[PDB]
Amino acid sequence: SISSRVKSKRIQLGLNQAELAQKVGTTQQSIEQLENGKTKRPRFLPELASALGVSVDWLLNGTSDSNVR
């Protein structure tokens, strides 16, 4: 799912939702809202994309290979 990508990448980055929120320049609450999927388009698209170091296109689509499941 969407949040799985963000969160999984967060885990791989070894960072948490609050750190990500600060790196994005928002509040953990906003991140958690995005994670549970209670928004349609995040204002912080570029900020999230940069925070993880992926493309907005991948934030929207979110496809980088598939090795089982």
Curated annotation (Swiss-Prot):
Every HTH cro/C1-type domain range: 6-59
DNA-binding span(s): 17-36
Domain of life according to the entry: Viruses
Keywords of the record: DNA-binding, Repressor, Transcription, Transcription regulation
Gene Ontology molecular function: any one: DNA binding
Function: Binds to two sets of three contiguous operator sites in the phage genome.
Summary of subunit composition and partner proteins: Homodimer, when bound to an operator.
Listed name of the protein: Repressor protein CI
Provenance organism: Enterobacteria phage 434 (Bacteriophage 434)
Gene: CI
Parent sequence residues shown: 2 to 70 of 95
